[PDB]
Amino acid sequence: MQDPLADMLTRIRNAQMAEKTVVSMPSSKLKAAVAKVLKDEGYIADFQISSEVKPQLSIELKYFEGKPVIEEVKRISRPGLRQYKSVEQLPKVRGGLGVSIVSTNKGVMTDRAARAAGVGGEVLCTVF
Amino acid sequence: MALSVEEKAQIVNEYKQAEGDTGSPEVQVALLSANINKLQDHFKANGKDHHSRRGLIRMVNQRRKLLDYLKGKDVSRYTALIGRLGLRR
């Protein structure tokens, strides 16, 4: 309703508790772009956009040993409290093993790349 | 829903923005205003009808919300609507 992005993570998180294979939900620039980071990071197998006037976003999910690959996904920059960090202040999820997706001005992209690119932005969510 | 289908069909065409238009705010506000004014006669005779007054208040709040949205969109269209309907008392 008032946070379509957090709807994406919770839809993903609920499915992995229920051992579902694919999920469907309306798409957007942020939803598709965050799916880009997740797929290139290996947390999701693949994502497609059903290009119609009302587009969906479909994610097929990954399980390694039955346990879902994404152990935990947590929203950070909620609409009630938008969170902005500098390059030095960007979070490190689980000591660098995880990824904290940060929407910088060079597109949506991970915290590891943001430090390399030397740009901060809005810390959207943390993954592990 | 105290307005008959004839009265509803009467006021929709005088306030429609185009043919087949029944959802434009002018139609909505005119639809609510005619129902609001009609119910005034009932509440005069029935002063203890607190349960039907909840619906009347909702129609009043709905009309206010529509007029505030029409305020943001086109102030000239808003001005003609209340002048024709005699609102903003």
Added chain:
Amino acid sequence: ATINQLVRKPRKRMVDKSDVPALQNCPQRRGVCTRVYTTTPKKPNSALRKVCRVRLTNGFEVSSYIGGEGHNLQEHSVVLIRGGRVKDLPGVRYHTVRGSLDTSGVKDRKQGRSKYGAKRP
């Protein structure tokens, strides 16, 4: 809890009142004894504790415990009172420092002499 609810009204911190109000942020005060008496402790204990009512230099009237065995204090005796209450004595919240001004230290004390104002022999 809501971050908006906190913005309007910040979290409030209670300030606990001191358990020694008559001492008034001082380590000790000087007072005179107005009444020397003995009182009975609560349910578990049963004894005759020596407590004296002290009129402090700031006008406060309080009762403080007299520690040790035997005391030489009577009416109109200048004493120094320190903080710390007595749990089995109702209404007693101060201790009388032995070995200062009129209240002499306990006689024949050998262990823990400094706490009771006892000379070294």
Added chain:
RNA sequence: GAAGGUGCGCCGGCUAGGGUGAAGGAUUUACUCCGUAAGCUCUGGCUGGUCGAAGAUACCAGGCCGCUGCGACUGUUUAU
């Protein structure tokens, strides 16, 4: 009028408005309307000076406050 306080006479300088009102104009229809300079008349405002012990100067013209009993109140009554 709780209580309590300030000003107040007289003579100048400046100044704001009522009313009435020949003219003139209008309806130059008539016991008509608008309006009118001066003159009379009423109400103010801002300043300055001045006399006395005293300016609401005489006559005229509330004393006031606090607690409490009774009757709610205006009224009526033992003409004497």
Added chain:
RNA sequence: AGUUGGUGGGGUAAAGGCCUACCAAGGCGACGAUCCGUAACUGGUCUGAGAGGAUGAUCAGUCACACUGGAACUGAGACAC
């Protein structure tokens, strides 16, 4: 109700209701005005992993005060320990 603006004038080393004459009815306030209690402020100090909490000795910067109230004089500079 000089209260908040405007206009003329005065006044200051200097702008300004700083003051005054006149005109208008303005100005501040739940984003806490006004009032009450407390209090010199800061760099800093203590504690805390940090975020924070408590505090404003020594030293340093600013401020205010000089037995109480007020006032000016001189002087570049004071309303002057």
Added chain:
RNA sequence: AAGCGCGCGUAGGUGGUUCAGCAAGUUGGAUGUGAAAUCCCCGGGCUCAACCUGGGAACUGCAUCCAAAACUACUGAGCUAGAGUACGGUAGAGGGUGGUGGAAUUUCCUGUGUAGCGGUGAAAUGCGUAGAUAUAGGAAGGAACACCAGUGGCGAAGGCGACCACCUGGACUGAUACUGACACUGAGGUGCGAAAGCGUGGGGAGCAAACAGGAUUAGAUACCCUGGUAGUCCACGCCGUAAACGAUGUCGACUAGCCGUUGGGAUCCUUGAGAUCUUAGUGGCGCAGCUAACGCGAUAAGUCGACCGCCUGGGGAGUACGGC
């Protein structure tokens, strides 16, 4: 210990999706400033240390300028997923105003008829020979609507049960048509809000605080019995509280299933008559998950997001004082 009794709604907070612009937020850099001392890092001098001191770091801030346009804010233009309107229909104790009906109670009148009736654990107060109770016929009056009746229905909640007529709100349901974010929440504020209670006027059958009498009891200001006033009923005002409870704020999204039930819709069955999906409610189990446990478990107390209200040991005390 803590969800306001419940709605609506002001300020505020937050807001679906697409394109373009801008650059306040946001990001990077530069410049000025952020006094010195202190904190910190590397050294130096007191025999070491405390101490002093060199340089650096920092002062997480502010101001200006330059770059960037993912997100927020703004601007402009759109879209239909939210929200809403137009149409047909369905169910309902939803509300208001008037009539009408049946059963029953009570009171009164009349007939029959004669020693009890009523009550209790048993009694007694009480009623009855002035003819009670019972029975039959008639009349008046008030209140509530048996069966239907159902973890059934409607309502924001409090609540709403006889029937009919009139006035009127909402919900559910199907497709098409239309507006195009018009939304959510909501401090103040405002409206409704059981029962009791209060005011004015009516009404008063049953019931029944108070009250009276009879029992019981050591006592019985009660439980039980006999009466019985306010009240309960109506209209217009006031009150504004309940264990006002699901002890669970509202709104939106997601997450195995199984068995009932109410109002619809679609398809097989067109079946005569069942079955399968779907929706809005209403219940019982239950995987996962949560929980201190009890338990919740698509009507979440699970995974989230927006907003609001509230809690900070027990008593004192939701009391005193002041305000409304």
Added chain:
RNA sequence: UUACCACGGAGUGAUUCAUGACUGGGGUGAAGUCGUAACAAGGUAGCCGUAGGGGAACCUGCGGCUGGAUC
């Protein structure tokens, strides 16, 4: 001599502190009197709001709830 103005004076309020015959509740007590109200179906289920009554816990009526036993 006028204007400004300190001290001082007058009246009338507000607020705060301390006391005050008497009076109300609250807490703590080594335990005294009267009952036994709640906890079991606590021996009349309890509790919530309200009203009336009573030495007292309490009782009674009206509505509500289960945070009630048996079934």
